[PDB]
Amino acid sequence: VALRGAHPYIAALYWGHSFCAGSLIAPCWVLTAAHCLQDRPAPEDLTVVLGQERRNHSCEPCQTLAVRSYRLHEAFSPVSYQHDLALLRLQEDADGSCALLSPYVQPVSLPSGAARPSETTLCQVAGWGHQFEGAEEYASFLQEAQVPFLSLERCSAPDVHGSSILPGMLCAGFLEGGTDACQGDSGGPLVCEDQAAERRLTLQGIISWGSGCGDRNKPGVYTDVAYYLAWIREHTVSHHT
């Protein structure tokens, strides 16, 4: 598998000094977490960079886009984080174009929903994660971890995430194994085996919440993209029908 062109769908989202990642699901659409947008920033103050290697760093294949509008799931809860997803409609330029697809910028495929994930499913989470403030020249690189899907039964254990796990959420990671809580970003991609899909890997999770960087790792909790599949289709459709 490739490495600088490793996760060409991952988007870097900026507002003020806050940060979130998301996933390019088509040239004009990015999928992220609703919690990233719950304070309702003006679309004009958002910046999306596709193809970025280091946060805050410009780069030759980096593409910077404005956002035209965005939609949070109408039922998102800021308290429990149930239904933690949003769509960004990117601003098209003079030509009707949004992301210029390239070897560094490519959309990720949505799950089929045919494929019901199991503890044997293999996944990957990408993100930048924790980085010490100051000294930009030392900005971290995108990194990735291989994580297994973690059953609802094991995730809802009192000892793991308890009654905090709600329908529409899924878990991935190791019970004690470690190292994802310091490397994922709110809204970032969990990409897993679909097999019943044209592509080998599809986007099956959006980084939602989990244990704090620094504490002992728990599995991360992700928005279960497949559960919202009709919501994502309906709000991206090209034509009213």
Author numbering: 359 to 599
Reproduce, without paraphrasing, sentences from the article in which this PDB structure was first reported.
The FXII Arg353–Val354 peptide bond is cleaved by kallikrein, generating α-FXIIa, which has a heavy chain of 50 kDa, connected to a light chain of 28 kDa by the Cys340–Cys467 disulfide bridge. Subsequent cleavage of α-FXIIa results in loss of the heavy chain and generation of the isolated protease domain termed β-FXIIa, which contains only a nine amino acid peptide heavy chain remnant disulfide bonded to the protease domain.
FXIIc is a protein-engineered zymogen-like construct with two additional residues present at the N-terminus, resulting from the cloning strategy, that effectively block the native N-terminal residue Val354. We term this the zymogen-like construct, as it is similar to the result of protein engineering of the N-terminus of FXa to induce zymogenicity. FXIIc crystallized more readily than FXIIac under a range of conditions for both glycosylated and deglycosylated samples at 19 °C. Data were collected to 2.1-Å resolution for the deglycosylated FXIIc sample, and Fig.2D shows the electron density in the region of the active site residue Ser195. In a second crystal form of the deglycosylated light chain, the S1 pocket loops are ordered, and a short α-helix in the 180-loop of the structure results in an enlarged and distorted S1 pocket with a buried conformation of Asp189, which is critical for P1 Arg substrate recognition. In FXIIc, Arg73 extends its side chain guanidinium group from the 70-loop of the N-terminal β-barrel to form a direct salt bridge with the buried Asp194 side chain. The Arg73 side chain from the 70-loop is stabilized by a number of interactions with the 140-loop, resulting in encirclement of the Arg73 guanidinium group and the formation of hydrogen bonds via the side chain of Gln151. In HGFA, the 140-loop forms a hairpin-like structure folded up against the side of the C-terminal β-barrel, interacting with the 180-loop close to the entrance of the S1 pocket. This folded-up 140-loop conformation is commonly observed in activated proteases, and contrasts with FXIIc, in which the 140-loop extends away from the body of the C-terminal β-barrel. In the current study, we report the first crystal structures of the FXII protease domain light chain. Both FXIIac and protein-engineered zymogen-like construct FXIIc structures reveal the conformational hallmarks of a zymogen, owing to the lack of an oxyanion hole, a disordered (FXIIac) or helical (FXIIc) 180-loop, and an extended 140-loop.
